[PDB]
């Protein structure tokens, strides 16, 4: 997903600190350590057609 820094509103990237994987902002010292599972499913469209014809 897309997450934004509460401080300045820039995009948050995922990096590694000294203890854990954390969201971080490229333009301010704001960080956020990851506590539990975070997921972003997309559910791409499946091929549904059987394609019998004629």
């Amino acid at each position: 997903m897309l997450l934004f820094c509460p401080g300045c509103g820039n995009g948050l990237i995922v990096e590694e600190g000294q203890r854990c994987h954390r969201f971080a902002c490229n333009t301010c010292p704001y960080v956020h350590n990851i506590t539990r599972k975070v997921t972003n499913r997309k559910y791409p469209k499946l091929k549904e057609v059987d394609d019998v014809l004629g």
Binding site: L2, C5, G9, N10, I13, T27
Partner: protein
């Protein structure tokens, strides 16, 4: 960047489509109005002296 994304739209597929542009912007160090103005001025062409 959050204000830009708000202006573009809050539908999920809209953010999915517009994400690569944000990533390309973040790859460069353009984060202020002055930096973007300097980039554009670099990308400017003089009208025959």
């Amino acid at each position: 960047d959050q204000e830009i994304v708000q202006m573009i739209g809050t539908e999920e597929h809209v953010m999915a489509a517009f994400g690569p542009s944000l990533e390309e912007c973040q790859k460069a160090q353009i984060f202020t109005q002055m930096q973007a103005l300097k980039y554009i001025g670099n990308k400017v062409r003089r009208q025959r002296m």
